[PDB]
From Swiss-Prot, chains A, B:
The gene is ksi. This is Steroid Delta-isomerase. The lineage of its organism: Bacteria, Pseudomonadati, Pseudomonadota, Betaproteobacteria, Burkholderiales. Its EC number is 5.3.3.1. It comes from Comamonas testosteroni (Pseudomonas testosteroni). Keywords: Isomerase, Lipid metabolism, Steroid metabolism. Substrate binds at D99. Gene3D superfamilies: 3.10.450.50. Homodimer.
Length: 125, 125
């Protein structure tokens, strides 16, 4: 059963992939039938094809990503706090959300939810 | 509808109530049909009574609860990072989970979920 270690490693591989603009790396962590809803409240993306599209779209700008707290993982689920930093209009922006992962028996993410809003968008000037 | 401001306000009143040992104030945040799953993977408690019993038991020992990061709020939902420190049998313990709040139309919480595992429990300090 999905151990804390495996789930936490998946989270780190996800963060590392984002940081490395590694698209195949991001998609490989998801189940072929996985769902991605980012942000929470919007229509989720179903399937490898849609998820790949989502992450590609998301990597337009170079992203600096890092886990800001320890990873929370239990009963095939994980939650992590982190930051996504990038340049937008000459300004250094920082989005701080909280992601949630639902792993399947195979050990792959079958559902990802990204909860963040306007109050979570910060920028250095 | 739910503004991020309102949801955040509720998140803070929740923490404050735990620190104040205010069982009534805690319960008053939830809807009469709400559910509490703490921790994630456990049998969710449904209803006011079930919920009151839950926090009733949780307040056996004085709790020191603090938000450790900005609250994330959007589309009727909120998630927050925090810690729960307490003592028992001469031994200080800190649990650092991530909670998820789902609100109904009347601004009340209809669902809470606390995600924390063995790696999120730090004994001794």
């Amino acid at each position: 059963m999905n151990t804390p270690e495996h789930m936490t490693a998946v989270v780190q591989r996800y963060v590392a992939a984002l940081n490395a603009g590694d698209l195949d790396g991001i998609v490989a962590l998801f189940a072929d039938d996985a769902t991605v809803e980012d942000p929470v409240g919007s229509e989720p993306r179903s399937g490898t094809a849609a998820i790949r599209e989502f992450y590609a779209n998301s990597l337009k700008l170079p992203l600096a990503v890092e886990l800001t707290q320890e990873v929370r993982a239990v009963a095939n689920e994980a939650a992590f706090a982190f930051i996504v930093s990038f340049e937008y209009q000459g300004r250094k922006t920082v989005v701080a959300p909280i992601d949630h992962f639902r792993f399947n028996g195979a050990g792959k993410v079958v559902s990802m939810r990204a909860l963040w809003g306007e109050k979570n968008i910060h920028a250095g000037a």
